[PDB]
Structure formats: structure tokens, C-alpha cells
Amino acid sequence: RYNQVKVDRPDWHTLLQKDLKGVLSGKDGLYILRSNKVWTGGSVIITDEFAVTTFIGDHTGNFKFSVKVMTTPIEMDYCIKVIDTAKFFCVMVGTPTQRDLVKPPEMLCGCGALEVQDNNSTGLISPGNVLPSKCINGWTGVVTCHCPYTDIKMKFLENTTPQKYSKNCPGTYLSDQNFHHDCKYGSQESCIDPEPTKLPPETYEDIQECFWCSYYIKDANFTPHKGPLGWCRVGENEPYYLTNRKSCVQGGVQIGSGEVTCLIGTTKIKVGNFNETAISFMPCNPIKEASRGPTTCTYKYAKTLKNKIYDEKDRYWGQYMVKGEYQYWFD
């Protein structure tokens, strides 16, 4: 139990008049620490690099405590010895040199700062006082504590084999839109080198909904474009996967936040002039407008951007019928 000396608990009275210092009894033995006691009323606070213990003794000579932990110890319990008498009790339990753990427990090191030895140059464990409970999918090496004033080196976590996967800790990352990414040395809590997960080939017919250019495609119909594109969700209530990388600027036209409402399949979209003098084809299908009032000339028309022409040529004239900011198609 990482203890060596028999534990004797003084009374509340002996605790007060006597001097107390924090100690570290292991297999090697007791290590003295520079402790300063504080007692005015019914409160006794011993402050140490390792921890801060508050002694509240209002009982019939009995004493109780609580501990604020500055640094977790390894393979040695943090006890309190009475100076000049054998009364030695043990307050803090301590923890082993935990090794080979994915999602390690948060181990504090206050006395000084941690030194990391990342094999494979993982650059995963951030430096400083604390070792967070960051999920560690793949990592190898040793993390050690240190303190300049007293050279105490404590091994918190050594990984020999890389345990890549944990049940509650994938090697994947999910964005806020459930966008599936793959982490080379990271998890959901902290992910190194995320690379989107590509959708499996030949399962495009299976996919239901896609997302692209700030617009959520409904039912994956995009008649003016090659199926599929963007981030696509297979089934429902599942994450999205990367399919086809297409720019949101087909020439000098931008999808979203635009002057001109049109259609990419069923989904209603807005389109705006990126380049004023860019001559390219509209990236969406047009909206029809019935102008047959009071047969006569019946045409259908759609609003269009400057120098931008929808793909449909007028049948009657075999030519792109445009005048002003409108395109027409006669019956």
C-alpha cells in the first residue's frame, strides 16, 4: 500500500501544540517536505508542494480532515508526521505509475512542470503543470513530473504499446454538423491531424441528404450537377462523409447570399455576382414565370445575373434569348 511506518493518530490537542510536516513514505522510505502550519481558531492548514490539508477537530479529541491536491504522488503515500514525537498518521493515499491507459486519469503536478517524451513525435500532451484526461488514442513514451527546488522526478504515465482504440474513445472526430473526420493521433476530446472520412465508393445511390455551399441539399437531387457532391449522409441520424470537393464559385458565380433566387434540383438557393464581367453559365436551374395575360406570344422568363446564362436554349430560336436581367423561353 506504499506505506512503511505504523500509523499512529494523535489527539486534537497534540496536533495543535506540536509541529507538523508533510512526508512521503514509500518502499525506499520517508521524504521530508517544507511544511508550514496555520492555527488561529478551529482550523489547521498545512501547505505543501504536494497538497494542502485542512484539519477540523471539534470532536472529543478526534480529528478529521480534507485535502486540496497540488501534485499527485507516485508509489508513496503523503502522510503527516509530528515533529519530535513518533505520532505519524497518513492522510493522502497516492497513486501507482499508471501505464498503458487510453484516456488516462487527470494527474496533477504542482511542485513543478511535466516533461514529455513523445515517441513518434506525437505532440499530443501539452506541457505544464497538469496532465489532463485527454483521450489518448495512439501514443507512446513517458511523461514525468519535476520540481527545481527539490529534484523529485515522478513517472505519471508510460506507454509501451500504442493502444489505438477505446470503447468510449474513437480515433474519429465529429463536427457540429456530424461531419466525420479521422484523427491520426487524436480523439473527440483532442484530435491531431484530422482528415475527413471519404464516403465508400458505389454507395452513392444509398445516400439520402448532402450539404454543400451553405445550403443543405434535400434528398440529394442536384439536377445541374454531377451526383453526388459535398458532405453526404447515408441513411438518417448518422454522420456525413466527404464525397466530391467542388468550389462554390463556378466561374464568377457564388452559391448563397445572392441577388437571384434559383434552383439546384429541388432546393431553393440564392446566387450572387462574384465577378462583374465574368461570362459563364448559371450554376442553377431557372424559375419559370407565366406572362400569358390576355392566341398570342406566350413566353416564360427567369431573372438572371449579368453575363450569366442558364443552360436552357430557347427552343423556338435555338439561341440564348436574353434581354436586360431576364432570360426568356417561348412556347
Ligand X SMILES: *[C@@H]1O[C@H](CO)[C@@H](O[C@@H]2O[C@H](CO)[C@@H](O)[C@H](O)[C@H]2NC(C)=O)[C@H](O)[C@H]1NC(C)=O
Ligand Y SMILES: *[C@@H]1O[C@H](CO)[C@@H](O[C@@H]2O[C@H](CO)[C@@H](O[C@@H]3O[C@H](CO[C@H]4O[C@H](CO)[C@@H](O)[C@H](O)[C@@H]4O)[C@@H](O)[C@H](O)[C@@H]3O)[C@H](O)[C@H]2NC(C)=O)[C@H](O)[C@H]1NC(C)=O
Q: x/- string (CB under 6 A) for ligand X, residues 91-130?
A: -----------------------------x----------
Q: How far apart are CA 98 and CA 104, in angstroms?
A: 8
Q: How far apart are CA 40 and CA 323, in angstroms?
A: 92
Residue number of the CB closest to ligand Y reads 275
Q: Which of ligand Y, a copy of itself, ligand X, none binds 234 (CB below 5-8 Å, type-dependent)?
A: none
**CB of residue 276 to a copy of itself, shortest distance in Å:** 19
Q: Which residues of 20-35 are buried (b: 16+ CB within 10 A; e: fewer)?
A: bbbbbbbeeeebebeb
The amino acid that residue 152 corresponds to is I
* Of 95, 93, 96, the residue nearest 7 (C-alpha): 93
Choice between 26 and 162, CB closer to ligand X: 162
Q: Which of ligand Y, a copy of itself, ligand X, none binds 320 (CB below 5-8 Å, type-dependent)?
A: a copy of itself
In DSSP terms, which residues pair with 272 in a beta bridge? 254
| Three state DSSP letters for 100-135 | CCCCCCCEECCCCCEEEEEECCCCCCCCECEECCCC
**CB of residue 274 to ligand Y, shortest distance in Å:** 8
Cell 457540429 appears where? 176
Q: How far apart are CA 314 and CA 323, in angstroms?
A: 13
Choice between 226 and 323, CB closer to a copy of itself: 323
Q: x/- string (CB under 6 A) for ligand X, residues 126-145?
A: ------------x-x-----
Q: Is 295 in the site for a copy of itself (CB under 8 A)?
A: no
Q: Which of a copy of itself, ligand X, ligand Y, none binds 275 (CB below 5-8 Å, type-dependent)?
A: ligand Y
Q: Which residues bind a copy of itself (CB under 8 A)?
A: 296-297, 316-321, 323
Q: Which residues bind ligand X (CB under 6 A)?
A: 120, 138, 140, 161-162
